[PDB]
Design a protein around this ligand. Sequence first.
Ligand code: CLM
Ligand code: K
Ligand code: MG
Ligand code: MG
Ligand code: MG
Ligand code: MG
Ligand code: MG
Ligand code: MG
Ligand code: MG
Ligand code: MG
Ligand code: MG
Ligand code: MG
Ligand code: MG
Ligand code: MG
Ligand code: MG
Ligand code: MG
Ligand code: MG
Ligand code: MG
Ligand code: MG
Ligand code: MG
Ligand code: MG
Ligand code: MG
Ligand code: MG
Ligand code: MG
Ligand code: MG
Ligand code: MG
Ligand code: MG
Ligand code: MG
Ligand code: MG
Ligand code: MG
Ligand code: MG
Ligand code: MG
Ligand code: MG
Ligand code: MG
Ligand code: MG
Ligand code: MG
Ligand code: MG
Ligand code: MG
Ligand code: MG
Ligand code: MG
Ligand code: MG
Ligand code: MG
Ligand code: MG
Ligand code: MG
Ligand code: MG
Ligand code: MG
Ligand code: MG
Ligand code: MG
Ligand code: MG
Ligand code: MG
Ligand code: MG
Ligand code: MG
Ligand code: MG
Ligand code: MG
Ligand code: MG
Ligand code: MG
Ligand code: MG
Ligand code: MG
Ligand code: ZN
Lengths: 122, 230, 118, 56, 119
Amino acid sequence: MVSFMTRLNVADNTGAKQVGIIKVLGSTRKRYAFLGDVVVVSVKDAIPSGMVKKGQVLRAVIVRTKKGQQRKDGTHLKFDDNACVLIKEDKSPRGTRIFGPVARELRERGYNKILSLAVEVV
Amino acid sequence: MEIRGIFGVKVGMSQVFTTNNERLPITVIYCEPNQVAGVKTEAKDKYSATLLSFDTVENKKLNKPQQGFFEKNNLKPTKHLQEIRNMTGFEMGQQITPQNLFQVGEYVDVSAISKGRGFTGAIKRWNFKIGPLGHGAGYPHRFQGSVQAGRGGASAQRVFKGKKMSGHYGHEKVTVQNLRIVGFDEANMLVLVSGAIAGPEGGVVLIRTAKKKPGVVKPIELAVQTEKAP
Amino acid sequence: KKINKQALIDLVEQKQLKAYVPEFSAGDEVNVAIKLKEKEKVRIQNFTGTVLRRRGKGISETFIVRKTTDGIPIEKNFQIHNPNISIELKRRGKVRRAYISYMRERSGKAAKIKERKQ
Amino acid sequence: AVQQRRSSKHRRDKRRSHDALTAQALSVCQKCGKKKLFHRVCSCGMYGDLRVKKAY
Amino acid sequence: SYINKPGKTSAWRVMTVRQQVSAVLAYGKIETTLKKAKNTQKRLDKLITLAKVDNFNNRRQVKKWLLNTNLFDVDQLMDHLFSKVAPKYEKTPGGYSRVLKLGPRRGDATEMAILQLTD
RNA sequence: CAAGGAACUCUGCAAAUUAACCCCGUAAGUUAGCGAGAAGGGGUGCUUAUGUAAAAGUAAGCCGCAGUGAAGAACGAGGGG
RNA sequence: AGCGAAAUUCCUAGUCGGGUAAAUUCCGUCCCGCUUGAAUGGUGUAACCAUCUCUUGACUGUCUCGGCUAUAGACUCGGUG
RNA sequence: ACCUCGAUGUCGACUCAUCUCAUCCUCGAGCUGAAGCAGGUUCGAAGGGUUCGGCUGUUCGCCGAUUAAAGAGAUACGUGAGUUGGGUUCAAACCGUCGUGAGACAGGUUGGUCCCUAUCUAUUGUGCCCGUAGGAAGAUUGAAGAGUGUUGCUUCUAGUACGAGAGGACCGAAGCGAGGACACCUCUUAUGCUCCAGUUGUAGCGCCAGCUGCACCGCUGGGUAGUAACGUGUCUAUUAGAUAAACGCUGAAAGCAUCUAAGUGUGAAACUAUCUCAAAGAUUAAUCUUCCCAUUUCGCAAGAAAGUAAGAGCCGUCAAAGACGAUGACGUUGAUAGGUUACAGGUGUAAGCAUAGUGAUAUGUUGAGCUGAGUAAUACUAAUUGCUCGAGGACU
Ligand SMILES: O=C(N[C@H](CO)[C@H](O)c1ccc([N+](=O)[O-])cc1)C(Cl)Cl
Ligand SMILES: [K+]
Ligand SMILES: [Mg+2]
Ligand SMILES: [Mg+2]
Ligand SMILES: [Mg+2]
Ligand SMILES: [Mg+2]
Ligand SMILES: [Mg+2]
Ligand SMILES: [Mg+2]
Ligand SMILES: [Mg+2]
Ligand SMILES: [Mg+2]
Ligand SMILES: [Mg+2]
Ligand SMILES: [Mg+2]
Ligand SMILES: [Mg+2]
Ligand SMILES: [Mg+2]
Ligand SMILES: [Mg+2]
Ligand SMILES: [Mg+2]
Ligand SMILES: [Mg+2]
Ligand SMILES: [Mg+2]
Ligand SMILES: [Mg+2]
Ligand SMILES: [Mg+2]
Ligand SMILES: [Mg+2]
Ligand SMILES: [Mg+2]
Ligand SMILES: [Mg+2]
Ligand SMILES: [Mg+2]
Ligand SMILES: [Mg+2]
Ligand SMILES: [Mg+2]
Ligand SMILES: [Mg+2]
Ligand SMILES: [Mg+2]
Ligand SMILES: [Mg+2]
Ligand SMILES: [Mg+2]
Ligand SMILES: [Mg+2]
Ligand SMILES: [Mg+2]
Ligand SMILES: [Mg+2]
Ligand SMILES: [Mg+2]
Ligand SMILES: [Mg+2]
Ligand SMILES: [Mg+2]
Ligand SMILES: [Mg+2]
Ligand SMILES: [Mg+2]
Ligand SMILES: [Mg+2]
Ligand SMILES: [Mg+2]
Ligand SMILES: [Mg+2]
Ligand SMILES: [Mg+2]
Ligand SMILES: [Mg+2]
Ligand SMILES: [Mg+2]
Ligand SMILES: [Mg+2]
Ligand SMILES: [Mg+2]
Ligand SMILES: [Mg+2]
Ligand SMILES: [Mg+2]
Ligand SMILES: [Mg+2]
Ligand SMILES: [Mg+2]
Ligand SMILES: [Mg+2]
Ligand SMILES: [Mg+2]
Ligand SMILES: [Mg+2]
Ligand SMILES: [Mg+2]
Ligand SMILES: [Mg+2]
Ligand SMILES: [Mg+2]
Ligand SMILES: [Mg+2]
Ligand SMILES: [Mg+2]
Ligand SMILES: [Zn+2]
């Protein structure tokens, strides 16, 4: 359960090494963000040859969590790091490739482009 | 309305896998055949109810007034007696089992006595917030919360009745509604009920027709494992 | 009127147990074929990896499988007696404990379990 | 906190009304007759028909 | 409040049962408190039933409980237990020890109890 | 004490990290003395053999999730009054 | 002369730049400095400080958010009081 | 300047909130310079909700990102016998300014002791006595009450209604959530001080091996039962009645008109119920069922001497319970607790022996050994052969 002002990694090609959460979008006092949740974030560690600049406030969706979540069948999916990919208003990823594995929770809440651009879904 | 009720003893909780790929936690209830000990009619009594007898025991473990009542009514001696409101349509002295009462997957609600917990504080009882632990503190850390309403003759000057403070917690009747029956076991007289049931294992449990959804029956079927042997 | 609660609990669990249920210890690498259901049909998706733990008694028997994709290690908790799930033991390995937590700390050449077991 | 008014000699006895004592249940030994409090070994160390301890 | 007494710690509790069990095995009677007698009975019975086979493994197991007493050392208590006491209870289905209640102490009013080996 | 890691608060108060020995490496500034244990890293167990007055060390092998296996040992960088 | 929104600036949370998603605090600079200023010394300054102030890495129950365990109390019995 | 100077602790923050409506959101309606969407204003409505941060001691305030919304106030500008002391306002020190000076400044800055074991009442829980007019054991009705009531997004309806176009519905249905609440431990985790294993130092068991004491439970990795959430089940619906604002139909006073005067309707998260809990000390003390009393004499009758039962209590073993009472199970005609047996779960192949190696160590016996609470049988041990209280219901 990624929470407010949590530094996590970006699994895409956009020039952003460390990103910090600002608000857990969706409701009032939404405590946590699980897989598939959308958040507003700020780039804190970036690169010179990157589309984003350090200090920009942007919108992201989370794809991995260290705590993990449990599915309906009883399977518990658990990664080792919290990761998000940069998305646009239309819900399309900002990067041109996706690094690492991605969850299946994206498929229910749209996000078809991220899955098709991913390496392998879990 | 047409309220159906049964009594049983909770033996534990398990899970079953179902078709549509869901893992459903279930509670297992041992339900003895219940005996209708009395029927009370609207015309003769001013209300309508059905009183059954369950949890049978030997006659030497029962008191004299109760065994006299049982022998006068020609019933099996039981140490537990309770009724449900608005239960009609059953003849006195008829054995009733949940199979004739509820369907395979209909919605029911369940009432049971909660697990006793004793004298608990305000935070564990009323979901209160704990005071700060660092940055300097005082003797009361697990504080209940200031009960001041007004100081002075023009104000209450008293803690208002029904305040939220420490006291007894547990051993109290509670009802959980809209629980779907999962399976019936006639040979073992065993009812499978989805979800979690209040009370310790072995306590009494009342299963009644849900007032929120009286006639709603959501289908549920289990999964057959096709796993072939080696 | 003595009530053996576990016998009744065992019976409800027996209603849906499996026949084979192949065995595996803590440090084993298995191949788990998930029978994922789409709108139609099934895509058999393999989750081959290393076991990390096996807890439970009956229908609640669970095991932990750890995998590594693109250098990212992912751990996934399966239920043994769960339909649409198939387990196939591949390599039997030697470990000195039941819950090898250090595998989620050791990685690379140091995350390889020697074969053989007794 | 301390009483701003002194408690009379009547409220004091009302509170002590629940301080009364209870007589412990006693029984008779089946070999010597002296009264002993119930469910306990007598002074001779003879409980029921079993010689427990040596005589006082 | 600080500089409190160490208290009835778990280590103290294990040592108390150990001390009492060694004495009741040496002499045959113990005059203790009822709540302490009700706790030594479990360890006393468990020791006796494991000492019914008289193999060297059982001696190592028993030695984690016995302590030196006045009438016997730690090595003759081993012989006394394994050759005199335990062989007597060869077919008794448990319940080798009995706890009975004495009167209250004059200076504490705590309920005393005698723990003995039931012949 | 899981996930997060100062979001708490007047303030990282308090608590937490480091901690012994040995081997590498160590900047700006300066009154050239310092800064400096700077920063940043690595090794430590047991056995055999070689080493010595004793070592330290060296080579091979073995075990454990972890080897000053427990106790006692410095948290750090930058700017300003 | 030097320094200057200062332990000094009332107006004032002064203008601008930097630090932050966002900065009455901080750093640099600007100068109508109401009322700075040269042995009640002025301006700099390496090292040092259980000094004050600000940013930051690791770190953690400070916190989101509370939970469990063990003692000594509290609570029950006997004695003093 | 009326109370208080033989003492009413004063800002802000934290915890707990309660109340009012002059309503921020949700709900209903009239008008619109209301095409639709989104608005503006007024009326009705207080059931619920009404975010997190940066700077400042701050209230306030500006800014950032969300939300359906980030309402206005009162309660000693609520709340220190509840917490803190950052600010103000003690003694210390310095700057600017005033004073010849000691000193001063709603000018600035650094530092700087916040006590009390609750008698009454109020409240949260739990008991004893007595009453309920014979006693006791059960099952009830419900007078008077308490608790909850929040809402969003997506899809369909439907690119339909409207609109040159752009854009884009009311009504209704389905799915998925956030917060809050109740319960539970199958799953995921946290804890799990008489559990298992590994392991260091030292002192002991005369030595090796193997154990014990101590070192935060010595440390480390797991972990039974129990306790919990970060976990998963459920609730946060619906309906009926009487209505507020508003709209009416039929209708005159006032031949027209007119919602009203008679009569008859519609109408909101507000009210009364439906939902959950508790409830006959409700002294206005209720109802039903069952069981036990129904002696011999003397005289005096809700009189005596003895004499008659259901049941309850004392005591013991306890835990579905629990501060102590109480609640619940049992007390030899018994499975209440311990022990034994078997098993589950947990830990991870025990000691010893044999082989191999020069040795540390590995391999086989061996999924072995061990195990606090867990499951079920088994009277082996402890619940003794005991004591006390307790009934004839006045009359109308
Ligand atoms: O004297 C005190 N309070 C007095 C009582 O007479 C009174 O309550 C008071 C409080 C605050 C105050 N003030 O903020 O100036 C003046 C008097 C306390 Cl300092 Cl003990
Ligand atoms: K005064
Ligand atoms: Mg103090
Ligand atoms: Mg404290
Ligand atoms: Mg008043
Ligand atoms: Mg008045
Ligand atoms: Mg008197
Ligand atoms: Mg008293
Ligand atoms: Mg110790
Ligand atoms: Mg943590
Ligand atoms: Mg972390
Ligand atoms: Mg804050
Ligand atoms: Mg802050
Ligand atoms: Mg400190
Ligand atoms: Mg330096
Ligand atoms: Mg300067
Ligand atoms: Mg000048
Ligand atoms: Mg200058
Ligand atoms: Mg300054
Ligand atoms: Mg600025
Ligand atoms: Mg300051
Ligand atoms: Mg400056
Ligand atoms: Mg001067
Ligand atoms: Mg001069
Ligand atoms: Mg001068
Ligand atoms: Mg200077
Ligand atoms: Mg100093
Ligand atoms: Mg004590
Ligand atoms: Mg006392
Ligand atoms: Mg005046
Ligand atoms: Mg006057
Ligand atoms: Mg006054
Ligand atoms: Mg006075
Ligand atoms: Mg006061
Ligand atoms: Mg109004
Ligand atoms: Mg209502
Ligand atoms: Mg900051
Ligand atoms: Mg005022
Ligand atoms: Mg105030
Ligand atoms: Mg206020
Ligand atoms: Mg004022
Ligand atoms: Mg107060
Ligand atoms: Mg206060
Ligand atoms: Mg105080
Ligand atoms: Mg006061
Ligand atoms: Mg201060
Ligand atoms: Mg201070
Ligand atoms: Mg001074
Ligand atoms: Mg002067
Ligand atoms: Mg009342
Ligand atoms: Mg479990
Ligand atoms: Mg040795
Ligand atoms: Mg309605
Ligand atoms: Mg109506
Ligand atoms: Mg008309
Ligand atoms: Mg009267
Ligand atoms: Mg038992
Ligand atoms: Mg062995
Ligand atoms: Zn006697």
